[PDB]
Amino acid sequence: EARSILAGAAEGKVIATTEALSFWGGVDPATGKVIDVHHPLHGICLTGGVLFMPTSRGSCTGSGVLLDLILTGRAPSALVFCEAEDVLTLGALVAAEMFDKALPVIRLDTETFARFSRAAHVRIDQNTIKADGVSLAVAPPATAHLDLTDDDRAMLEGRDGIAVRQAMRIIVAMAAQQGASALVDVTQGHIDGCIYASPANLTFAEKMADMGGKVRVPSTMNAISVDKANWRAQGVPEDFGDPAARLADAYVRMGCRPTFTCSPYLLDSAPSAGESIGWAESNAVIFANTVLGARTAKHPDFLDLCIAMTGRAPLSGVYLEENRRPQRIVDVALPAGIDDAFWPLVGYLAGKAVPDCIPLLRGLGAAKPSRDDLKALCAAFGTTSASPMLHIEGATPEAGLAPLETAETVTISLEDMAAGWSLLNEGPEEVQLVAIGCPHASLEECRALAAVFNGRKRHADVAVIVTAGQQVIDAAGKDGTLQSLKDSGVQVLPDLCWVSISEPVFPTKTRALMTNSGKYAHYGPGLSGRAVRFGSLADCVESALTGRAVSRLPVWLS
Numbered sequence: 036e037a038r039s040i041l042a043g044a045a046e047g048k049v050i051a052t053t054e055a056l057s058f059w060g061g062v063d064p065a066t067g068k069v070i071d072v073h074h075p076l077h078g079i080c081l082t083g084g085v086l087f088m089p090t091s092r093g094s095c096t097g098s099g100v101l102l103d104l105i106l107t108g109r110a111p112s113a114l115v116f117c118e119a120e121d122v123l124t125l126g127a128l129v130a131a132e133m134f135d136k137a138l139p140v141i142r143l144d145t146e147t148f149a150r151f152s153r154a155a156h157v158r159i160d161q162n163t164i165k166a167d168g169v170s171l172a173v174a175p176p177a178t179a180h181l182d183l184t185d186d187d188r189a190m191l192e193g194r195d196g197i198a199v200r201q202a203m204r205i206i207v208a209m210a211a212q213q214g215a216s217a218l219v220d221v222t223q224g225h226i227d228g229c230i231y232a233s234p235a236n237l238t239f240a241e242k243m244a245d246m247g248g249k250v251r252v253p254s255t256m257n258a259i260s261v262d263k264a265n266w267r268a269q270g271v272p273e274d275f276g277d278p279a280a281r282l283a284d285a286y287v288r289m290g291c292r293p294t295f296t297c298s299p300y301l302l303d304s305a306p307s308a309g310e311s312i313g314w315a316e317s318n319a320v321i322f323a324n325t326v327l328g329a330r331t332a333k334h335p336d337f338l339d340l341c342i343a344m345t346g347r348a349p350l351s352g353v354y355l356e357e358n359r360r361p362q363r364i365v366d367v368a369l370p371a372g373i374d375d376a377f378w379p380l381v382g383y384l385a386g387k388a389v390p391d392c393i394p395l396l397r398g399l400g401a402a403k404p405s406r407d408d409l410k411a412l413c414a415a416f417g418t419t420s421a422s423p424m425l426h427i428e429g430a431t432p433e434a435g436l437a438p439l440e441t442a443e444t445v446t447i448s449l450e451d452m453a454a455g456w457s458l459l460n461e462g463p464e465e466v467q468l469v470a471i472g473c474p475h476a477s478l479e480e481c482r483a484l485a486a487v488f489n490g491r492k493r494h495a496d497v498a499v500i501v502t503a504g505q506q507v508i509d510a511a512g513k514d515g516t517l518q519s520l521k522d523s524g525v526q527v528l529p530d531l532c533w534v535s536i537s538e539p540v541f542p543t544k545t546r547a548l549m550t551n552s553g554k555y556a557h558y559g560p561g562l563s564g565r566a567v568r569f570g571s572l573a574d575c576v577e578s579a580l581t582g583r584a585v586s587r588l589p590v591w592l593s
């Protein structure tokens with residue numbers, strides 16, 4: 036079978052892979068080249084080709100990256116998946132709805148996906164897809180068999196303005212390709228497209244704001260690409276900082292709260308269990324479903340604003356209880372003597388083992404991970420998987436849900452962990468930067484960082500930078516944690532995250548960095564061009580003191 040998701044026609048090289056790719060962090064919008072150093076397609080330029088991959092993974096920001104690639108002509112000619120997909124499909128949907136450029140997206144059956152992937156040339160139209168001259172019928176897009184309340188139809192008819200109508204059109208089209216049957220109310224939103232990942236990110240926000248866009252539910256804002264109050268004094272180039280600040284300005288104007296944080300679940304406004312929200316940012320989505328028991332799909336950038344403007348989201352995916360049941364079982368080895376570095380590594384490896392469905396992690400309940408531990412795990416899980424949630428037996432409030440009767444069992448062994456640890460430590464021992472706070476550090480994290488520092492001060496050659504939300508930095512000033520960190524030579528930066536940081540705030544002298552973030556360990560090398568080392572919090576501080584990160588497997592892997 037061949038299903039048309041978004042109509043259109045294309046032709047070019049078959050660029051095929053069996054592993055999902057995040058377009059934000061994995062594809063350079065300036066060149067169209069794969070920059071994920073851990074992906075098989077690394078170094079390949081995707082422009083003009085027909086990309087064959089099972090689905091997407093990682094960042095909600097891939098929609099803005101694809102939209103920019105479409106606007107500059109550097110995009111692939113088309114996208115072929117073999118499973119459900121939202122992020123790239125939404126990006127191509129925004130391109131057709133608001134920007135003229137039709138990129139075709141087709142979902143295949145698995146075996147015709149494997150057959151067509153080993154091909155050399157592929158062509159598409161509204162009718163057919165050819166793999167060297169093996170024409171196959173493409174079934175038309177799925178009919179929207181959706182409920183629309185009277186207020187839904189009224190918004191869709193333009194009774195709340197053109198911006199609200201354009202939001203509803205995108206939501207209804209996304210609901211149609213997701214096979215939904217209705218929309219669902221959301222109580223709050225979290226906008227992720229406020230990162231300046233590409234010029235198109237700003238173009239979309241200004242176009243929605245100039246059409247009258249305003250959010251209907253309380254909506255927070257994710258990390259942005261400037262220290263909003265200080266980027267001019269920091270020497271950030273005007274060519275970058277001005278549109279980056281204007282992008283954040285556009286969403287504040289549309290009524291979003293200027294929280295500028297990728298850990299909104301740490302704010303006083305965090306949702307509770309059973310609450311239906313509309314969140315983007317993959318780590319926050321995963322944390323909201325996994326840890327808090329709230330409900331939100333992993334909404335791509337741009338769709339988050341649409342949901343916030345309407346207060347409505349497609350009733351599909353993990354909004355429904357049946358779709359929250361574990362879809363695969365993962366038996367994780369529990370070695371003795373685990374520290375904080377265990378949890379991001381497990382999340383990273385769990386996503387590689389379960390990249391396309393919801394896992395239940397077994398064998399870890401007695402370990403009692405902190406909220407920060409689960410925070411690091413969910414963030415790392417997001418980088419290697421597409422799923423919006425996971426379960427941890429004996430840790431997360433919904434882990435008792437009956438696994439689906441299709442659920443298979445896989446393992447994460449000690450050998451799996453040693454390979455992953457080495458995978459994330461492809462760098463030297465000399466480091467000039469310690470990167471903490473991806474996602475944004477909690478107050479407990481900043482206090483734990485100061486406790487490990489024990490009043491010492493960093494090596495002069497090693498910068499130590501912590502990214503956190505403004506509200507955490509405000510609280511760290513009250514209880515004295517901030518001054519203690521600055522006593523040790525640590526810089527605490529608001530608004531920015533390591534995903535969005537750039538020179539010169541990212542010190543240009545840096546050749547290698549160490550981080551305690553599994554997420555940034557994966558994305559860091561391609562985003563920064565530097566070598567990246569991964570370790571525990573104390574491994575980071577020791578690197579900060581000595582200038583050096585000892586190349587070694589951890590205590591619990593020896």
Ligand code: FES
Nearest residue numbers: 258297474532534
């Ligand atoms: S912006 Fe995604 S984790 Fe900080």
Ligand code: NA
Nearest residue numbers: 093094417418
């Ligand atoms: Na991600």
